[PDB]
Amino acid sequence: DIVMTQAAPSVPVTPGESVSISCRSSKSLLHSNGYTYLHWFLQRPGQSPQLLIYRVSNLASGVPDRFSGSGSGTAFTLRFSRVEAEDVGVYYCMQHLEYPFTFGSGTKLEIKRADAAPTVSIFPPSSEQLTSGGASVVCFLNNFYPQDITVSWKIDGAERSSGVLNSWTDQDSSDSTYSMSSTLTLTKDEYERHSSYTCEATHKTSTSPITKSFNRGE
Amino acid sequence: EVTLQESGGGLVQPGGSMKLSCAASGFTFSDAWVDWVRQSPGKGLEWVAEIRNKANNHATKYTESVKGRFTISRDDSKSSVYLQMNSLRAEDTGIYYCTSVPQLGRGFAYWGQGTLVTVSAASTTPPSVYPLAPGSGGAGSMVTLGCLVKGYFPEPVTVTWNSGALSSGVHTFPAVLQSDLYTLSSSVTVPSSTWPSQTVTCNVAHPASSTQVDKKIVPK
C-alpha cells in the first residue's frame, strides 16, 4: 500500500494571508504515461468531500482561483494565495496511482481571530421531562474563541463528573467561533434531592470561572 | 447538472446483509469508472471498491478487508451502481459515498451526499423532544433557546427551527451516545424582540422511525 502522510493535524491562519499545506507519498506517483496521480480534496464540516485539484496542479471546475498546487515525485503542496474565513475544513491529498487508493489523514485549516468570551446559558429540566421521570440540565457555551474550554458541574457546591455528556461544534465558517454543549443527566428523584445547579466554565477570556446557576426550588 | 445520489443505508444487524444504490445523472455515466469510499473515525477516508466501464470489461477491484464480502455492480441502462454488502461487521459502520472518475485523469470529480450505515444489534427507537426555555426575564439584547432530543437510535435526526426560517443563530451539536441511547441538543439565539412575542418552534425528524415532532418553546 502507498502511504500518504500529512504531518500537520491542523494549521492556524489569519484571513488575508497565504499559507501552504504539505503531503508526502511513500512512493513516486509518476505514472508511465507521464501524469502524476495526486489529487487534493476539501471536506467542509458535515458535508461530503469535494475535489479541489487533480493531478498535482489542475484546478477543478468551480474551484476558487486562490487555490494552487505544486510538487513532484513524492512531495506535494497545496497553497492558498489569500485565505478566507469560509475556508475552514479538512484538506486531504490522495494517490490515484495504485490499488488500493489511499488518502492522507488530512490537515484541518483553523482560522485565527480575536478572543471571544462564551455566552453561557443554563436550562433547568423542562416540566415535560420531569413528568416523564427524567431531569437533564443543559448548559450551552456558545460562540467563543480560542477553541479550548473546560466545563465543570456542581450540585449544591459539590462537583459532579459522572453522567455528563459533552459535545462540540466545528469552527464556524462565518464568525470563526466554536460552541459547546454540556448536559448533566439526572433522574427526577436525584434532581429533587438537591437545589443548586451550576455550570462553571473556564476559558482564556476570563481569569475567573464563568458561572451560571439556578435553584430547583424556584 | 451533475449529481450522484446514494440510498439504502441505515441500521443493519451484525452478520446481516445490505445493498446500497447510487443513481447518476448530468454526465456520461457509461464512460465513467465508479467507486465507493467510506468514512469512519480512526480510518478517516477509506477507498472500498470500484467497477470500470464496459470498454474496460466492467472489471472490479476491492480493498482487502471487504473482498469476498462485498460485491459492486452497475446497470448502465439505469445509470446506477450498487454495493451489495454481506456478513457485515461493526467495523463496516460509517458514511458511504459514491464517487466517479468521469474521464481519464480527472480524479474523483463527483461525489454523492453520503449514506450512514450503522452495524449494530440495538433496535430502532424514536426520540422524545423537550423545549428548553430561559429561566428569568430577557434583558439582554439576545435570548438563547434550545431543544433537547433524546432517547433515539440510530442516527441521524434532522432538527430545524421554524421549519427552516431560522438558521443564522443556530447551533446543532453532535449527538452523544450512552445508556439512554442518543442525546442531541440544538440551540438558537434570536433578538429578545422576537421571542416570546413570536412563535419559536423546534422541528425534529427521525427518518429511521418515521417520527416527526414539532414542539413550541414557551416561557416558563
Ligand SMILES: O=C(O[C@H]1C[C@@H]2CC[C@@H]([NH2+]2)[C@H]1C(=O)[O-])c1ccccc1
Ligand atoms: O479512472 C480511470 O482510469 C484509471 C486508470 C488507472 C487506475 C486509476 C487511475 N489510473 C485512473 C486514471 O485516471 O488514469 C478512467 C475513467 C474513465 C475513463 C477512462 C479511465
